[PDB]
Design a protein around this ligand. Structure first.
Ligand SMILES: Nc1ncnc2c1ncn2[C@@H]1O[C@H](COP(=O)(O)OP(=O)(O)OP(=O)(O)O)[C@@H](O)[C@H]1O
Ligand SMILES: Nc1ncnc2c1ncn2[C@@H]1O[C@H](COP(=O)(O)OP(=O)(O)OP(=O)(O)O)[C@@H](O)[C@H]1O
Ligand SMILES: [Mg+2]
Ligand SMILES: [Mg+2]
Lengths: 179, 179
């Protein structure tokens, strides 16, 4: 069966932390594809901008794609809705939902994760400054990067080079996203 | 006076840790340029390959250039020789020698650093897993990346995406540098 990575995120902006994590997981579980899924709509940049920055970010990687499913569904994004639609859209694939330590704790604490485990294999990945502890835990390269830090840098005219892809650096400057 | 960053390195390969560090320093001290200087000739990849990967890596950044001075001098690279030649090649500029915590300790422990401080301002930067303590100490984004780890990944056919620039990922694959 086809092995599809899934990685949800606000992606405001997508950064090298998100991308290095997806790439490690893709290697360790021999995934054919990773679909990045921008969440639907602290100011959150419009959905279309977050979507496009994600297409630009993932463009160069032969295995990474983007779904606009969550942004098009409308309203709030729940993990169950994301995976169910992906199950319907890729009936013959095995889904691997990729999630960093903070968002994993949140799913385990606040969602019916037993149901979620019936829709996909869960791959919890490490993130600097958080505690990682049917579900698999993987250590990915330690890149202490948050979108928050990027948004603060962009607003203070401080550089986000080498924290996000060159495409995202350009895209943030051109559309003036966080100033 | 013109403010020139200088960053020496083996650059085998250059990675996002090196580049994010140079970029932070460039912002904090309003540098006009950062010159990356590959050291002259554990197998170290030929000088020309390390040089080119550095040109490719720094290409997209308007403020980053490369000097082939150290690789062309011949023999072993000493910090004093690097800075003296840069002083001669850019007589009217102020040099800022950029160096991570491990290489800083090594210079302070093993070289006549008082002389070196007469040729340039020293900017010690943080690196994960090392202790940072005329000289300035700056915290740069924490990206736990080493060329060593990249070389080991490349040799085991494991991905170095988002640890090095896309150009370096391509360049390592094409010339098969560490396999
Ligand atoms: N540096 C990182 N390394 C690994 N996983 C990360 C990293 N940053 C975020 N993640 C994971 O990426 C997913 C989406 O994160 P999210 O969109 O909130 O990004 P973010 O960097 O945390 O932005 P923000 O700081 O605005 O919350 C989550 O599963 C989260 O755990
Ligand atoms: N992740 C990093 N963040 C900040 N500085 C770094 C980082 N990696 C290396 N440096 C600095 O880059 C300069 C050159 O390092 P070098 O060429 O030895 O790279 P490296 O990553 O340590 O490779 P190797 O692992 O083969 O020693 C030094 O001043 C070093 O302290
Ligand atoms: Mg977050
Ligand atoms: Mg080193």
């Amino acid at each position: 069966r086809r092995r599809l990575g899934v990685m949800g995120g606000t992606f405001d902006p997508i950064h090298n932390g998100h991308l290095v994590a997806a790439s490690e997981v893709a290697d360790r579980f021999a995934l054919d594809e990773v679909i990045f899924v921008p969440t639907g709509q602290r100011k959150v940049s419009p959905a279309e901008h977050r979507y496009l920055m994600t297409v630009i970010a993932t463009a160069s990687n032969p295995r990474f794609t983007v779904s606009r499913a969550d942004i098009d569904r409308g309203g709030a994004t729940y993990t169950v809705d994301t995976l169910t639609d992906l199950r319907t859209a890729h009936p013959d694939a095995d889904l691997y939902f990729i999630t960093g330590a903070d968002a994993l704790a949140s799913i385990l604490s606040w969602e019916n994760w037993e149901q979620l485990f019936t829709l996909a294999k869960f791959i919890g990945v490490s993130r600097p400054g958080y505690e990682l502890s049917g579900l698999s835990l993987v250590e990915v390269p330690a890149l202490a990067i948050s979108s928050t830090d990027c948004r603060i840098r962009a607003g203070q005219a401080r550089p986000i080079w080498y924290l996000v892809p060159d495409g995202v650096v350009q895209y943030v400057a051109k559309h003036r996203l966080y100033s």
